[PDB]
Amino acid sequence: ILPLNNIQGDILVGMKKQKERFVFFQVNDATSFKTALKTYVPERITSAAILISDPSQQPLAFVNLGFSNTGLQALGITDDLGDAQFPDGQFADAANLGDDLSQWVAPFTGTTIHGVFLIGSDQDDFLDQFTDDISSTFGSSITQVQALSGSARPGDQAGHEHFGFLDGISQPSVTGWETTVFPGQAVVPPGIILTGRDGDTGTRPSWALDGSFMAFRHFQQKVPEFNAYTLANAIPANSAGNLTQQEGAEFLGARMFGRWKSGAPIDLAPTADDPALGADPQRNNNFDYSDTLTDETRCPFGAHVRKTNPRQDLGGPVDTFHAMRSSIPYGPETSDAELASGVTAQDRGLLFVEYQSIIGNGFRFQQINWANNANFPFSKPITPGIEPIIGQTTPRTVGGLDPLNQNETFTVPLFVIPKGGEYFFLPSISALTATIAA
Numbered sequence: 001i002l003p004l005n006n007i008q009g010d011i012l013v014g015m016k017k018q019k020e021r022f023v024f025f026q027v028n029d030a031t032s033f034k035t036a037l038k039t040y041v042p043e044r045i046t047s048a049a050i051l052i053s054d055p056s057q058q059p060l061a062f063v064n065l066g067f068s069n070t071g072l073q074a075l076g077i078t079d080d081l082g083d084a085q086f087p088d089g090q091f092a093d094a095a096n097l098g099d100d101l102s103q104w105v106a107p108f109t110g111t112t113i114h115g116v117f118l119i120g121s122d123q124d125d126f127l128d129q130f131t132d133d134i135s136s137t138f139g140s141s142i143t144q145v146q147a148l149s150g151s152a153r154p155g156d157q158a159g160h161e162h163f164g165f166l167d168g169i170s171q172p173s174v175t176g177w178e179t180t181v182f183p184g185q186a187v188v189p190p191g192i193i194l195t196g197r198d199g200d201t202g203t204r205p206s207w208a209l210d211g212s213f214m215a216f217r218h219f220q221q222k223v224p225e226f227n228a229y230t231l232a233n234a235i236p237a238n239s240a241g242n243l244t245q246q247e248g249a250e251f252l253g254a255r256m257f258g259r260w261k262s263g264a265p266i267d268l269a270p271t272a273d274d275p276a277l278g279a280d281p282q283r284n285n286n287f288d289y290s291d292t293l294t295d296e297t298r299c300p301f302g303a304h305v306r307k308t309n310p311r312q313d314l315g316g317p318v319d320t321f322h323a324m325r326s327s328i329p330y331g332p333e334t335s336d337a338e339l340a341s342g343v344t345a346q347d348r349g350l351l352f353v354e355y356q357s358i359i360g361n362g363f364r365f366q367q368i369n370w371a372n373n374a375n376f377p378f379s380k381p382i383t384p385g386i387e388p389i390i391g392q393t394t395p396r397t398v399g400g401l402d403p404l405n406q407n408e409t410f411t412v413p414l415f416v417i418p419k420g421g422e423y424f425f426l427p428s429i430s431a432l433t434a435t436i437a438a
């Protein structure tokens, strides 16, 4: 049984708050930081247990805390955590991910960042109150080098990311606790997500039990450009009949993602949106590509969700490459004038968060081995190509987007720009005080 009171809640349950702030910091004084941390943790650090408690018993803000390798070093915590990528940091790994390094910005361009406080709350003012509480408690023991703040989109776009698609539908379920499991949801041993638990194969210090590694990515999105691209390349028809340009553009977007904007998976709804299905957690994940392993009519081989979770393209259930996501959009809505121009005029995007016990098996495997690999999934009659949303290999050519002309290739401009990121370790709540602050 997992000790839910000891696991940082964003890892297992997800904050699911309307607003979130990532406060990136450096440690200035290890001794002063450690005593501040011992004060802070029992008061503010939110467990999985709290996140599944009655909302009345919940605090106004949830706080979680992760450390980079240099943060652990600054604190004299020098035990090897057993991950191949964590020690060097993400900037050193960015070229491997396919990133254009010229688009990276401070303070991510190095290993200056020692950690991140994640604050989830209902309003920006509450984020400010909890940020000020960090300032008051830690004082000059830290320097806040950057804060990145996000917000759920308004109205019926709540839960949707900036291109318009419902995000946060498909997550693995870990064994070791009692929770609801939906049809089609992968059930994995807890060590796929939690370091030191069954299923983890990395060599972990005992104090690393029930922690997890976060891959953080700051993505800027080019929404008018995406919209204009789908209009310019609108699919003329599908199996059900001819499409108006607007229908064909919406369909092309769905083909790129593998889901309609509503969340309806195209493997179940291959020709038209089914918003009732999109909003149905009991059915919106109940598919595995077994009905489309050797053709692309129902779903392209290279659609976002199929690349990042290949399901039956792997030949059966595989524990190893599942990961939890707790991303949040940021920035203003895209104006009518922006969409008309087809050109981005404001900074908006995704503060992307993915948790796994082995960075190389979760985020990094999904990115490099799968999304960036034109020849993945394997053994297909048409080359899948590069995942159109986040695949980084050039040329960004993907096949099969038009179900009636599957050999047609699309060369897709990059609409998602990495601006920085880092690899963090989130310890257990007890480890925060018993180890990190010792």
Ligand code: HEM
Pocket (backbone or CB within 6 Å): 161, 162, 163, 165, 166, 167, 168, 169, 170, 171, 217, 219, 221, 257, 259, 304, 305, 306, 308, 309, 323, 349, 350, 352, 354, 363, 364, 366, 367, 389, 390, 416
């Ligand atoms: C701005 C960039 C991105 C956007 C807009 C985006 C959007 C989405 C959307 C709309 C979904 C479908 C709903 C869901 O299952 O949650 C999804 C699923 C998913 N995405 Fe992304 N994503 C982005 C980047 C990434 C990256 C960089 C990765 C990992 C390398 C990733 C991994 C996944 C995974 C694992 C799923 C669930 C797949 C499944 O289990 O079927 N995404 N994403």
Ligand SMILES: *[C@@H]1O[C@H](CO)[C@@H](O)[C@H](O)[C@H]1NC(C)=O
Pocket (backbone or CB within 6 Å): 236, 242
């Ligand atoms: C469908 O679209 C084609 C052009 O792509 C057109 O020739 C045809 O008349 C349309 N309608 C039907 C019912 O086939």
Ligand SMILES: COc1cccc(OC)c1O
Pocket (backbone or CB within 6 Å): 184, 185, 186, 285, 286, 287, 288, 309, 310, 311, 312, 314, 316, 317, 318, 319
């Ligand atoms: C329906 O869900 C699945 C089926 C088969 C394999 C999966 O992950 C590799 C998976 O997530």
Ligand SMILES: COc1cccc(OC)c1O
Pocket (backbone or CB within 6 Å): 293, 294, 379, 380, 381, 382
């Ligand atoms: C019928 O399915 C196929 C036919 C020809 C080649 C294939 O992959 C190499 C394939 O999967």
